[PDB]
Amino acid sequence: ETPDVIGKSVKEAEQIFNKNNLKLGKISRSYSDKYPENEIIKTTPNTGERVERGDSVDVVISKGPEKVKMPNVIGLPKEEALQKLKSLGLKDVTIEKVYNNQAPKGYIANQSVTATEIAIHDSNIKLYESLGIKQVYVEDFEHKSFSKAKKALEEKGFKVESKEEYSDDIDEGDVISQSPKGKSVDEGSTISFVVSKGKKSVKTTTESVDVPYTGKNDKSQKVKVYIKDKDNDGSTEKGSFDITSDQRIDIPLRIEKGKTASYIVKVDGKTVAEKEVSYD
Numbered sequence: 570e571t572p573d574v575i576g577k578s579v580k581e582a583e584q585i586f587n588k589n590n591l592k593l594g595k596i597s598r599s600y601s602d603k604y605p606e607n608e609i610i611k612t613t614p615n616t617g618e619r620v621e622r623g624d625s626v627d628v629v630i631s632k633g634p635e636k637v638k639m640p641n642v643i644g645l646p647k648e649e650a651l652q653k654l655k656s657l658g659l660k661d662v663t664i665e666k667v668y669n670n671q672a673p674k675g676y677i678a679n680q681s682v683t684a685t686e687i688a689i690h691d692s693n694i695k696l697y698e699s700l701g702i703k704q705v706y707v708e709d710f711e712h713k714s715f716s717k718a719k720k721a722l723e724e725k726g727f728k729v730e731s732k733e734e735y736s737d738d739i740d741e742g743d744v745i746s747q748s749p750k751g752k753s754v755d756e757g758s759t760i761s762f763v764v765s766k767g768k769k770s771v772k773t774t775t776e777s778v779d780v781p782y783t784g785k786n787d788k789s790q791k792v793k794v795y796i797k798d799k800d801n802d803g804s805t806e807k808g809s810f811d812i813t814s815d816q817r818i819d820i821p822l823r824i825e826k827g828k829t830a831s832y833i834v835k836v837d838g839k840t841v842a843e844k845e846v847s848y849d
């Protein structure tokens with residue numbers, strides 16, 4: 570009767586067969602998850618099946634788990650991702666939904682197994698499907714205190730920006746306007762505020778500068794005057810006009826106590842003149 574060599578090596582199996590007056594038969598190789606590579610998987614005849622003196626016994630050997638190359642599915646829609654996995658015999662796939670900022674809602678943000686040889690049985694792939702970015706509600710603070718606005722929205726993860734403007738009907742430090750507001754938007758979004766610095770209720774200079782024209786083809790040049798003073802942060806131009814000849818230009822500046830104001834005059838993008846002026 571056929572001896573049991575299952576889980577054994579070929580080396581040992583032939584030893585057991587010879588001892589039993591039998592020959593090692595043909596050797597073939599099969600993928601297996603149950604048996605470590607180069608262990609007997611199966612015999613013909615099977616263990617305990619009747620045999621006669623000198624008959625051979627064929628053996629099948631483990632080539633270890635059958636494997637594939639893990640595909641890259643990050644950024645594909647869920648169903649494309651799963652199909653691409655099935656197409657390789659990878660069917661043990663669990664989905665986990667998470668918020669994410671790289672892949673849109675319904676698209677795979679992450680793979681368990683990096684884009685590697687994997688066994689096609691009990692592979693335990695996990696795919697992380699994006700729910701999009703977490704939506705957080707932006708509290709509408711129009712006509713309320715900016716300080717409270719900034720702080721409340723900071724604590725919900727928002728980035729807060731503000732410029733200031735004069736107002737006759739909105740208390741100092743109260744919000745003229747807010748964008749966005751009254752709405753849920755992506756976590757961490759920037760909320761923009763226009764804030765009241767009270768009513769337009771400082772010294773005064775008119776500075777003169779001669780701007781030369783340096784253009785070609787009898788074509789005008791564009792002059793841009795940028796001012797930093799009481800109510801101007803030199804952000805955008807306080808003056809914008811074309812020049813076709815030398816022009817004397819006057820630049821009104823209003824300066825607080827203990828401060829300096831300044832002007833820059835550019836001509837076709839290039840600085841031509843600049844000056845600092847103190848509250849004198």
Ligand SMILES: [Eu+2]
Nearest residue numbers: 570617618619
């Ligand atoms: Eu028997």
Ligand SMILES: [Eu+2]
Nearest residue numbers: 606631632633
């Ligand atoms: Eu191998």
Ligand SMILES: [Eu+2]
Nearest residue numbers: 661691692693
């Ligand atoms: Eu499994």
Ligand SMILES: [Eu+2]
Nearest residue numbers: 785786787788
């Ligand atoms: Eu000419």
